[PDB]
Design a protein around this ligand. Structure first.
Ligand SMILES: N[C@@H](CCC(=O)N[C@@H](CS)C(=O)NCC(=O)O)C(=O)O
Ligand SMILES: N[C@@H](CCC(=O)N[C@@H](CS)C(=O)NCC(=O)O)C(=O)O
Lengths: 205, 212
């Protein structure tokens, strides 16, 4: 295929890209990379991504080699998702896109505490503190969804793609949270999307 | 009554606010600033939290487009696409992405390392400094500078052929790090780029102010 994706399936950031590719019905070749798969710390990979992280996406059609999951999602949307996942109007686009930055700058670090502490390990305090932080972030997201159906606004979009893989993990590590009805309604609509069920709804490991 | 269509909330010594001030100045857009953050308050008021539940700055209102927007990088990309076509916005998705990745990286990778140093040397007195943490922050930032130096080996700007929003995202952090009394391993491509920035009137106006 013209598109190559490096990354493992149990990565939030890789999931964003796999999910976008599936939503847009784009063909791609996956190369397992990260963790016990290696590849991502090889000299040849570091020449493509000096951070040595996944995902990495190559698009031979546009001579593109791109890292940063959110940039990859926005690229795929603009290039292949016109009138589907790309919002043309800058202001309406921004209202959704802010949630991409927020997903990685605010939600991800709180999520990391839980995924590390519970799944891939423990420090009662640490974790309990991360749970409180995530519960508070869930309150914020619940309010954000009080008057619109999607983080991207009127329609499902790239803000929703950025946030949901983290939320998926947090709702599947045996924890029970304060009920958040707007957030839960939103999550249910994601579970109805075949691409989400395929890519995101897999075991937490 | 001398009021503008764009309102910006935030204090001048914030990296994230600087990105937006700098963009507004590059595009020669009129704006009204409302000081907010730190000792200025405003950002934890109920009225402000209703606009930005994170209670952080910057926040930008654009009355022309009925927009109320937080996240500095999203604000910069908005201004570029709306007001900076053929100046700061790169139309081609792939060529745009090559620059825009550096916006994500600035805030996800550079910012946390910068934060250690800014908090430690600028906003903590010597008697309370964690010298170990600062030294580790310095090591980390020196390694990130090596990465940025290599990235600039074969192109003039993070945004590619021309100055752009990837450059805007990275530079305010680099400015602080170069103005806190530290000497770094030389990085010739990074230094050449930084000098380029110092020749831009909007950068001199907004970014090149005292580190406090
Ligand atoms: N800012 C990057 C973060 C990427 C990242 O942290 N990737 C992780 C997986 S979630 C990784 O490569 N970890 C090292 C490994 O798996 O070997 C992005 O959003 O794409
Ligand atoms: N992710 C946000 C982060 C904003 C942020 O951290 N703002 C800081 C200033 S750099 C702030 O508001 N601190 C609280 C304060 O100044 O009271 C963005 O990029 O705009």
């Amino acid at each position: 295929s013209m598109i190559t994706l490096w990354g493992r399936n149990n990565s939030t950031n890789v999931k964003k890209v796999l999910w976008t590719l599936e939503e847009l019905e784009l063909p791609y070749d996956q190369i397992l990379a990260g963790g016990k798969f290696g590849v991502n710390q090889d000299a040849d990979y570091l020449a493509m991504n000096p951070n040595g992280l996944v995902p990495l996406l190559k698009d031979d059609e546009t001579d593109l080699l791109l890292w940063e999951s959110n940039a990859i999602v926005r690229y795929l949307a603009a290039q292949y998702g016109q009138n589907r996942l790309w919002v043309d109007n800058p202001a309406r686009r921004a209202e959704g896109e802010k949630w991409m930055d927020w997903a990685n700058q605010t939600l991800s670090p709180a999520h990391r505490v839980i995924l590390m502490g519970l799944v891939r390990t423990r420090d009662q305090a640490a974790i309990e503190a991360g749970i409180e932080k995530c519960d508070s972030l869930f309150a914020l997201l619940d309010d954000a969804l009080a008057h619109q159906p999607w983080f991207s606004g009127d329609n499902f979009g790239t803000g929703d793609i950025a946030i949901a893989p983290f939320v998926y993990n947090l709702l599947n590590v045996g924890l029970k949270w304060t009920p958040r009805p707007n957030l839960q309604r939103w999550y249910q609509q994601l579970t109805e999307r075949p691409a989400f069920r395929k890519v995101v709804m897999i075991p937490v490991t």
